[model samples]
Target: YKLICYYTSWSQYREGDGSCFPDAIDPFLCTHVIYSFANISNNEIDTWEWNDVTLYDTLNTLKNRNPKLKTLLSVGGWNFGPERFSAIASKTQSRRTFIKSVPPFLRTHGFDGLDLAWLYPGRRDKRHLTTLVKEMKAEFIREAQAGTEQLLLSAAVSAGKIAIDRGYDIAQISRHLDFISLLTYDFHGAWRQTVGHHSPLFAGNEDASSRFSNADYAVSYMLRLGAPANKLVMGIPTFGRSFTLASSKTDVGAPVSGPGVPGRFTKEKGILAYYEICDFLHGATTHRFRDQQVPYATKGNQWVAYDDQESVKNKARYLKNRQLAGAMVWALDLDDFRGTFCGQNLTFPLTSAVKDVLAEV
Candidate 1:
């Protein structure tokens, strides 16, 4: 089983020395580390000035400690949007230009390959996406036939059924890549008026929107649509989706006013890292939705939906039992990176739990 973890470049300057950098990582725990995003500028790869050489060199240096650790440069996240990808993928010349550039860039940076974290493809992007991967794979194949080293190719896909249906030709797309990482979390968030699990393994009986709402549904749908289960890596968020209550009422379906206050460390509204969520849970009421098999905690108006050590272990067990490829963490930095906050007992607890169960599988 492959345990892939994302290492966000921006997390290097969050607030304190506890902020995560490539050096802080325990590289042995993950088979591959995906560096989150180098932009697509004028059909060529664009690395952030800070990450261009300095960060990339530091990240690749992890191999000095763990020779088995592999790294990939992930391009085009949610911020990059689908327009950039659609533009390049639509034209053969554009696709060739980008495809031709990838190998040299990966080799130059000491990366093993590239991950197309397109976030999604819209209705207009469907055919182009298929073309993109096919062309990219063909290029990779040509290089390998010439006796050049082959680079791994992968993409991060949406979990929502509507997104899947419109964004991919699953069968055609699956054949060109090494694996697919499902953005299986974020089923619910502050964007909705009602509160619910952000990443439930199974849909709750009360969830009328079960047809496309849980990890089980997403994975089964992908397989039925022709995605290989062994090539599908389930994504686990190291953070939580949070919301503030509209009224004093607090329950699974309670109305929400807006996103919860940003965490002291993460400082992102509507989301908090596991460490911050752990701190917020102090003196708060915790609830586990038995049917959905996930947990949440609430204190006054603050409410958060996240996976703990127990829930993470269950998710790992689910992946193991399903004979899935493996699990991927949204990021390694968010899971109490320093083992200082969120109690010494539970430090790196979520990642530790996942490793323990998946290792057994």
Candidate 2:
């Protein structure tokens, strides 16, 4: 099980120290670093929170530290993603522009490859993305054929059918690219208009739809569709999604009547970051769901839904049984550091479990 740890510039900045890449990460075990955010401009590029030297130097040092490690640039996350893909990947000229610009930037920073994280290519009523994926592959292959040494080509893609159907031919995409990272954890979220499971395998509550929140469903769907097991990576969520309960009263399927936390932080409205949720969990105990293999906690009207060690063990077994290539996490920064979020002892439990299971497999 190859684990890909992602460190965002904004996230590092939010944490106050940018040394998470070099200091906090265990480079030997982490096969890949999906480096995000090299802001592009008309004539110049943006460096955002991380400077070129620090990133390059750290990666170089990490390279020296772990000879087998790899780095890939991941562009367009939540706020800045899934649009303009057709434009950037449309013609040969645009592709060349990106290719030419990206490498030099990485070279200057001493990084490795690029992982295209276009949120949605055909989603939100866009043009057909088949051509875009093909062209992007062509550009990567072109770079490789032209002798760009050790640079990798990968993509972080949506697990939904719409994305798989219209984005790229899985086998064809696999030919030019290394593998595809399927985001499997956002199965349940606050997008719904009711209080229910945010990331449950089955319907925890009547209002919670079982349509989109399981590791097996997404993995099986991809394999059946055309994705090769060795080339498909299941994405895991390091954080949890929360919701406000009915006066802190809880039942597995009890339906709550009314809106609770409504902003981005509220369980009913906003999504909370890992650190914020960790702070929230400092004063709570865990509630485990056996059938789903996940855990949660409720304090007063505040309810939290998240995955834990037991669930991770279950998920890892599922990944191995399905013969997946590896697991890719949405991030490393959000995990419970030293058990601050889950307990005083469960930081990065999922990652540790993944490594163990993969080793056995």
Candidate 3:
């Protein structure tokens, strides 16, 4: 089983203790640490942050501390958008330039692999995604046979059907890529007029909009589409999808005006880091919904849905029960790395919970 943890390159820019640097990672906490995200330039992979070069060096150094840990450099994120990905991937020649650039970059930066994180490939871009994956894997094999180690390849994929069917040729990509990181979070958020848990383990009350909006549903959908069980790495979020209650009812399906007030630390509206959620829960009333195996907290007009240790460990149980690959946290920085906000014996309370439970017999 794998515990692939992603570390956002911009996390270091957060305020004071809110900031998480590469050095903040505990080597033992994850089996693979994928640094997100590198940029694409003129059809070739490129570095994004001014300090990313040094950060890659720092990130790869984690493996020196834990010989078992693997590091992967992820290209693209939600911010990288799909235009660049579409531009490069839409054509064979441009795709070749991008795919061929992966291995040397990994070897140069000391990463064991590359994680393609195109947010979602559109309808016409579907075939191109396969071409990119198939060719990229072939390139990796070519480099390895001529080569350090065979460079691993993976992708961070969407969970929704619209995105999944429109973006992925699952069977083809599955055959080529090492693993598919299923992004099971963000099913609902402040965008909706109603409140919903962002990452429910199981589907709750179904509406046309939410019938298949859960982790279990996504897994079932992927499996039905022929994605191998062993390569499906379920995602766990280290933050909450928050909302501002439109009515006095703070129930799960209650009306919502918009996102909850921004976190003092993360300062992002519509979301709160797990640590920030902990801070929000100070005087809030929390409710655990057995059906979803997740929780929601209410404070004044702000309603936030998120995973606690209980929920994450339970998610690990779900992963194990399905014999899936493992859990992949969307981000390492958002968790309580200092172990302060959420009272626990150690840092990464949510991540460690998944690890500990997944290790069970």
Candidate 4:
């Protein structure tokens, strides 16, 4: 199993502390470290910061610690959105330009490959998306035939059935991709009027509304659509979705007025990192595990749905049992990377749980 973890570039400046610098990453913990979200500038690939180029070199240096570790540059994320990618993939010439630019840039910077992370392509983008993948794959093959360094190609895809159907030619895309990282979490969040599990193993019978709204259903549907199990990596969140309960009761399907109060460190309303949630849970009331598959805690009006060691372990076991590729964390730094904040007095506890189970398998 491949343990892939995303390392966000901006994490180095989280709260203006260098706690999550590239040096802080334990290379042995992950098989692939994806440096996220180099932006799209005027139809060309660009970096978010002036120092990003320097940081790129530093990130690749982690391989010295574990030669087995590979690094990938993940371009386009939720922030980059579909417009930039849509435009780049729309025309053969535009696609050729984008494809031509990536290999040289990756080779120059010592990256192993690239991860295309378009949030979600629309119906209009269906053929264009496939064309982009095919064109990129052709380049990858050409490099191999010429005895040049070959690059592995991969993509982060949405798990929702509707989005998958509209946005991708799953079977065709999978053939070109080394693997597809499914954003299996975020099944429900602050966007919903009611609170729901951000990443549930299964949609319990009680929540018939979410019968097809859990990780299990998403993975099954992807497989049913012809995505190979060995090339499908299920995403695990190191952060939690926060919500403000409208009433005192804090349960699945409970009314929610809005997002929960922002975290002191993360400072993002409606979202909290595992470390921040750990601290909140210390003072929070009514911590509980739902449907024997998810964990949650409530503090006054603030309610959080997150994965704990137990939930993470369960998810890893599910990956192994389902014959999936492996597990992936949204961002490595979101976990208690420093080992100081979590209640269990552990470091990378969520990731550790995942690694342990997969190792056994």
| Model 3 weakest 10-residue run by lDDT | 203-212
Candidate 4 per-residue lDDT, tens place, 1-361, comes to 9988998887776774325877778888999999987877656666886788888989999898799889999988887767878888997887888888888788888899989998889999989989988889888888777687679899999888788988899999999999899998878893889877778888777768557678899999999999999999999999999999999878767899999898777777889888888788877875545563888889889888888888899989988999999988888888888878876677788888889999993
Report the CA-based lDDT of candidate 4 relative to the real structure: 0.85
Runs with alpha carbons beyond 4 Å of true place in candidate 3: 205-209
Tens-place lDDT per residue, model 3, 1-361, is 9999999988888898898999989999999999989988877888999999999999888888899999998988888778878888888898899888878888888999999898879998998999999999999999988656899999999999888988799999999999999999978872888888889998755444567889999999999999999999999999998888989997656988887898887888888899988888889999988888899999888888999989999889998999999999978999999888787658999899889988888
Error of 1 at 79 (Å): 1.3
Per-residue CA lDDT of model 1 for 57-117, tens digit only, reads: 9989999999988899999887776777888888888888888988888888899888998
**Cα displacement (Å) at residue 99, model 2:** 3.0
Name the best candidate (by lDDT). 3
Better candidate number, 2 or 3, judged by lDDT: 3
Which candidate would rank higher by lDDT, 1 or 2? Answer: 1
What is the C-alpha local distance difference test score of each model?
0.86, 0.63, 0.89, 0.85
Which of candidates 1 and 2 reaches a greater TM-score?
1
Q: Candidate 2 — what's its lDDT?
A: 0.63
Q: What is the lDDT of residue 296 in candidate 1?
A: 93
Clashes of 3: 0
